[PDB]
Amino acid sequence: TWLSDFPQAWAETGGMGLAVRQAPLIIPLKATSTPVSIKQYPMSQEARLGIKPHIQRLLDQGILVPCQSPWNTPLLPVKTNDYRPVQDLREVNKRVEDIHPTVPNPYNLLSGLPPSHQWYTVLDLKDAFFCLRLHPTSQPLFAFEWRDPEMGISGQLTWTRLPQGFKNSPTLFDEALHRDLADFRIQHPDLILLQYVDDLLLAATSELDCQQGTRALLQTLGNLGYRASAKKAQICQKQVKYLGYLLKEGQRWLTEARKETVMGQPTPKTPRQLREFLGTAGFCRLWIPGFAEMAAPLYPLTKTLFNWGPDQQKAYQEIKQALLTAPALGLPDLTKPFELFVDEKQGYAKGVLTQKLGPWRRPVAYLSKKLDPVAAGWPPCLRMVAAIAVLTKDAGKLTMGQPLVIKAPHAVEALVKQPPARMTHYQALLLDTDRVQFGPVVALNPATLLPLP
């Protein structure tokens, strides 16, 4: 019934997308750039015949158009017996002006979601980038060659919409939609709307508010020319998957699918493989307690010889073990006080940001960082101070200057005041007791990192 009441909004019924409020895009190039014409890949026939209807359908939609350009890039077939066209815009991307990535990575986005809104509707937009038009100035940029030896049709085609493979399509679209939805954001103070490029989350306090909000959102998305996938929608559910995170009743999990992308990486044998392993797993560092110290043996194996010893394997094992046993994280409650439990061992700072839940403490985040070399050399009880200081600044990213209590296995509010160099900067954000308070000393659990009775 959600399908009929909004025909224009679903890609299944509402046809092709087109941001009506968006002007055609001009694509600035680098100053030293010059047209590059790459010879066409001598395509197979088995591919050229499966690719053909996709191309024809784009011509009918006017998204592809004939042209004649000094530019040209390869059109490769890809992957059942379903061949889809994919254009190698590498040499083009190199010649285009870079832009500031204003896209907030999934986590920092989800972090902006309150627990008081436990009714979710997730949507994704079908053929997002194509909804944006390409100004005739910069169309010739994405020209490619199309032939059909069964016809003798060696001509050129190019895109009238923002293409796939172009390095700036994500940011551009994100900005476009963010602009196009500001109005909807304004006219719904009771709803939270989250956005990663073409992935949308609508959070509401009640189920009613959610339903109505979703109706509004769909009507708007329709009116704007955007089109959502009805097959993959998650409408008005207490529990939803969004950007590879499971949201359910004021709580947040790593979906198993998101785990797999790290769990499924073979033991890195080259330094680059290890780099990207840590790079991928690094996104889930706020689920891994003591991650900075845990992944310590693996860091030095970068850019040197690659001695994959027992330590490296042990760490590599810990990191996956820590994902298999990754906890639930509660969405930060900015209408509550925060508690921060900090600890340090061997020049690595680890800690946990928690909040009240019933009489229990529910972890909001696990904070861990390496102490800079100068601090890493400091004596035992000073590195603690350094650790607390470092983690506090990271917690600030989540608490938003809210009231925050600190606890450590060796309380140390004193030494902050009477240091017998770098203190001028530490006393700044620590002795500011409007946001920051201390607590009694207390040792914490090596795993959970919560206090001991």
**Amino acid in position 50:** G
d(CA 29, CA 8): 36
> Would you say the C-alpha torsion 212, 214, 217, 223 has a positive or negative sign?
negative
Tell me: is residue 283 an annotated ligand-binding position: yes
Q: Which residues pair with 396 in a beta bridge?
A: none
Residue 405 to residues 328, 342, 399, 436, Cα–Cα distance (Å): 22, 11, 11, 6
Read off φ and ψ for residue 213, nearest 5 degrees.
Answer: -55, -45
Asked if residues 294 and 348 have their Cβ atoms less than 8 Å apart, the reply is: no
Tell me: is residue 272 an annotated ligand-binding position: yes
Tell me: is residue 104 an annotated ligand-binding position: yes
SS3 track for the chain? CCCCCCCCCECCCCCCCCCCCCCCECCCECCCCCCCECCCCCCCHHHHHHCHHHHHHHHHCCCEEEECCCCEECEEEECCCCCEEEECCHHHHCCECCCCCCCCCHHHHHCCCCCCCCEEEEEEECCCHHHCEECCCCHHHHCEEECCCCCCCCEEEEECECCCCCCCHHHHHHHHHHHHHHHHHHCCCCCEEEEECCEEEEEECCHHHHHHHHHHHHHHHHHHCCCECCCCCEEEECEEECCCEEEECCEEEECHHHHHHHHCCCCCCCHHHHHHHHHHHHHHCCCCCCHHHHCCCCCCCCCCCCCCCHHHHHHHHHHHHHHHCCCCEECCCCCCCEEEEEEECCCEEEEEEEEEECCEEEEEEEEEEECCHHHHCCCHHHHHHHHHHHHHHHHHHHHCCCCEEEECCCCCCCCCCCCCCCHHHHHHHHCCCCCEEECCCCCECCCCCCECC
Residue 277 tokens, joined: 């392993």
The domains located in the chain, with CATH, are 1-23+97-132+167-255 (3.30.70.270), 24-96+133-166 (3.10.10.10), 256-332 (no CATH), 333-408 (3.10.20.370)
d(CA 139, CA 44): 27
Tell me: is residue 168 an annotated ligand-binding position: yes
- Provide the phi-psi class of 367: left if phi over 0, else alpha when psi is between -120 and 50, else beta: beta
Tell me: is residue 90 an annotated ligand-binding position: yes
298-299-303-307 Cα dihedral, nearest 10 degrees: -30
| Solved using | X-ray
Residue that the structure tokens 């073409």 belong to: 198
Read off φ and ψ for residue 55, nearest 5 degrees.
Answer: -70, -45
d(CA 402, CA 355): 12
Residue 223 tokens, joined: 């009116």
Asked if residues 159 and 64 have their Cβ atoms less than 8 Å apart, the reply is: yes
Using alpha carbons, select from 431, 357, 446 the residue that is nearest to residue 388. 431
Residue 168 tokens, joined: 């700036």
Residue that the structure tokens 């815009």 belong to: 89
Q: CB 153: neighbour CB atoms within 10 A?
A: 9
d(CA 89, CA 164): 9
Q: Cα–chain-centroid distance for residue 396?
A: 20
Q: Which residues pair with 351 in a beta bridge?
A: 342, 367
Tell me: is residue 147 an annotated ligand-binding position: no
Tell me: is residue 397 an annotated ligand-binding position: yes
> Would you say the C-alpha torsion 186, 192, 196, 197 has a positive or negative sign?
negative
- Burial classification of residue 374, based on how many CB atoms lie within 10 Å of its CB (0-12 exposed, 13-18 middle, 19 or more buried): exposed
Tell me: is residue 417 an annotated ligand-binding position: no
Tell me: is residue 369 an annotated ligand-binding position: yes
Asked if residues 241 and 249 have their Cβ atoms less than 8 Å apart, the reply is: no
Residue 427 tokens, joined: 């006393």
Residue 389 tokens, joined: 């200081």
Strands 245-248 and 251-254, sheet pairing: antiparallel
Contacting residues for 137 by C-beta, under 8 A, at least 6 apart? 26, 27
Tell me: is residue 199 an annotated ligand-binding position: yes
d(CA 125, CA 193): 15
Using alpha carbons, select from 124, 118, 123 the residue that is nearest to residue 203. 118
Tell me: is residue 170 an annotated ligand-binding position: yes
Tell me: is residue 198 an annotated ligand-binding position: yes
Residue that the structure tokens 């080259």 belong to: 270
The maximal CA–CA distance of the chain, rounded, in angstroms, is 86
- Provide the phi-psi class of 223: left if phi over 0, else alpha when psi is between -120 and 50, else beta: alpha
CA gyration radius, the chain: 26
Tell me: is residue 88 an annotated ligand-binding position: yes
Strands 404-407 and 338-344, sheet pairing: parallel
- Burial classification of residue 186, based on how many CB atoms lie within 10 Å of its CB (0-12 exposed, 13-18 middle, 19 or more buried): exposed
Tell me: is residue 83 an annotated ligand-binding position: no
Residue 216 tokens, joined: 């509004």
Resolution in A: 3.0
For the stretch 305-308, contacts whose Cβ atoms lie closer than 8 Å and that sit 24 or more positions apart, written own/partner, are: 306/269, 306/270, 306/271, 306/274, 308/267, 308/268, 308/269
